[PDB]
């Protein structure tokens, strides 16, 4: 169907892309393929796709969707990534309703782990939403869609007004120059709210009504929500970005430290405040006809070509 892939069910839709499910024909692995038709793209949108690809090449994390191969024809551009066979947070909330604070805490820890990692590599997501927080086979978070993401310099103001309206920070609606991480922290507050409530803090019939709600900053806090959880959300959803919690303050919040001691979370957050070759895989690739030194050169040069994908997929 497409190169070495057998395409099937559509699993996602973007403004200019269609994400279809696919199988690697040589590795038998299950992957996702973002399909983009370059013919319907302006030069501003063509740059935003190439920026997304470069940003994804920098992010290798257990809770971020992993890019495997980038293929580009005269009129098409395909991004082959890992497939999350468990679903997405939005579908999970539609099927089962609000999560218990214990279940929500585990997923929220996984989200902040991946968002903190991004901010360490100087990248802001700018499109965190329930429908973009996928779930693997074990129901573990894998953040997807870095189309609206951008590189930032700590202390710089960004000027791209983008994001999912129900999760977008007030500054974005107001068209103000903003601090990247502070915009992601607001989205995280909405994500935490919707995880424990099964509903949005700011909602409406139209985008105009939704905007008025977000700019008000007022939101109902349900009876079932703990005092510790309410404090965390109220300190993330703050109209003044300077008065919002930082990523480090979120990770050390009383609600976050609740329940059993989580040293695996501490190890992942400490890694963000700062590998060898699988010789068995390299031998198997040599048997398929693929050159040993050419595979190593593809791996070290971040080519994300046929040799990179077969190595990365085989290491699973």
């Amino acid at each position: 169907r497409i190169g070495y892939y057998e395409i099937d069910r559509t699993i996602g839709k973007g403004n200019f892309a269609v994400v279809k499910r696919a199988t690697h024909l040589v590795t038998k692995a299950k992957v996702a393929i973002k399909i983009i038709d370059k013919t319907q793209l302006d030069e501003e949108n063509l740059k935003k796709i190439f920026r997304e690809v470069q940003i994804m090449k920098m992010l290798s994390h257990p809770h971020i969707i992993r890019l495997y191969q980038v293929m580009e024809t005269e009129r098409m551009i395909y991004l082959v990534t890992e497939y999350a066979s468990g679903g997405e947070i939005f579908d999970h909330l539609v099927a089962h309703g609000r999560m218990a604070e214990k279940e929500a805490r585990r997923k929220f820890k996984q989200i902040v782990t991946a968002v903190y990692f991004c901010h360490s590599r100087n990248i802001v997501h700018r499109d965190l939403k329930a429908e973009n927080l996928l779930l693997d086979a074990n129901l573990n978070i894998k953040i997807a869609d870095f189309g609206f993401s951008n590189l930032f310099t700590p202390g710089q103001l960004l000027k791209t007004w983008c994001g999912s309206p129900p999760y977008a920070a007030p500054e974005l609606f107001e068209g103000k120059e903003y601090d990247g991480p502070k915009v992601d922290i607001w989205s995280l507050g909405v994500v935490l709210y919707v995880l424990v409530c099964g509903a949005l803090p700011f909602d409406g019939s139209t985008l105009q009504n939704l905007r008025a709600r977000v700019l008000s900053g007022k939101f109902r806090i349900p009876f079932f929500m703990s005092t510790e959880c309410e404090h965390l959300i109220r300190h993330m959803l703050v109209l003044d970005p300077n008065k919002r919690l930082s990523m480090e303050q979120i990770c050390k919040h009383k609600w976050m430290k609740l329940g059993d001691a989580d040293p695996n979370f501490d190890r992942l957050i400490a890694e963000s405040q700062q590998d060898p070759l699988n010789e068995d895989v390299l031998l198997a690739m040599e048997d398929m006809g693929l050159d040993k030194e050419q595979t190593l050169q593809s791996l070290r040069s971040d080519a994300y070509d046929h040799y990179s994908a077969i190595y990365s997929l085989l290491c699973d």
Epitope: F90, V94, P165, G198, A199, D203, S205, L207, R220
Partner: single-chain antibody, 236 residues
């Protein structure tokens, strides 16, 4: 043709929780809302899908005790009301929002309930101003007023429902003046600033029923508000 099949009636002890189902049995993606009606009382919106933005939207009154879920695979929608009290004894209906297929984030829905389930009687055992009653002689014209505020009628379309005894409310007027298929031209709607009116011309004995006006209220995260219900009585 397409029908909403609800679960059977039940008795719950106070403090417990009840789960009601609603399965679509026809030519299928929908926007099911849950509406309850206490014995001899008016209809009340509890929650359901009302925007393209969130997984569910609940009425403030029910936010703390309602859970609304859906099984896409089987076309079944669920409702779970917890911490039941004697005040939760009511008939629970599931209703589909007509213009769901038109929702875009920019398109403003009318929030008219196209299809209603037959109702589920759950028993616990151990905003819009409408006149309580209206009357007229056959052949005459009866008009029901429905006043509200600028957040609801002032900003949205008004829909009217007719409820016959022992049956679920039925859409009578949608989008202020429109009539669904089957509704005669005798019934007509109107809306001016914050008030709506329903005119029943050439009144017949068959029109003796309760009439409810409804509109989307933009207060809070949005909710559908209902009138108290007008009991039209057709004289001799």
């Amino acid at each position: 043709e397409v029908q909403l099949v609800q679960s059977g009636a039940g008795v719950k002890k106070p403090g417990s929780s009840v789960k009601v189902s609603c399965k679509s049995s026809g030519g299928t993606s929908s926007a099911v809302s849950w509406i309850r009606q206490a014995p001899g009382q008016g209809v009340e919106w509890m929650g359901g899908i009302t925007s393209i933005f969130g997984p569910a939207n609940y009425a403030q009154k029910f936010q703390d005790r309602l859970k609304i879920t859906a099984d896409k695979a089987t076309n079944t929608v669920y409702m779970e009301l917890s911490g039941l009290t004697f005040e939760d004894t009511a008939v629970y209906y599931c209703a589909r929002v007509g213009d769901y297929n038109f929702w875009n984030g920019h398109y403003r829905s009318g929030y008219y309930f196209d299809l209603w389930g037959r109702g589920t009687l759950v028993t616990v055992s151990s905003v819009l101003t409408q006149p309580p009653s209206a009357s007229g002689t056959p052949g005459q014209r009866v008009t029901i007023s429905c006043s509200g505020s600028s957040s609801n009628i002032g900003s949205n379309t008004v829909n009217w429902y007719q409820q016959l005894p022992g049956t679920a409310p039925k859409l009578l007027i949608y989008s202020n003046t429109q009539r669904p298929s089957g509704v005669p031209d005798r019934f007509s709607g109107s809306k001016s600033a914050t008030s709506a009116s329903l005119a029943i011309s050439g009144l017949q004995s068959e029109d003796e029923a309760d009439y409810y006006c409804a509109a989307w209220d933009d207060s809070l995260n949005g909710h559908v508000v209902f009138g108290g219900g007008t009991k039209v009585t057709v004289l001799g």
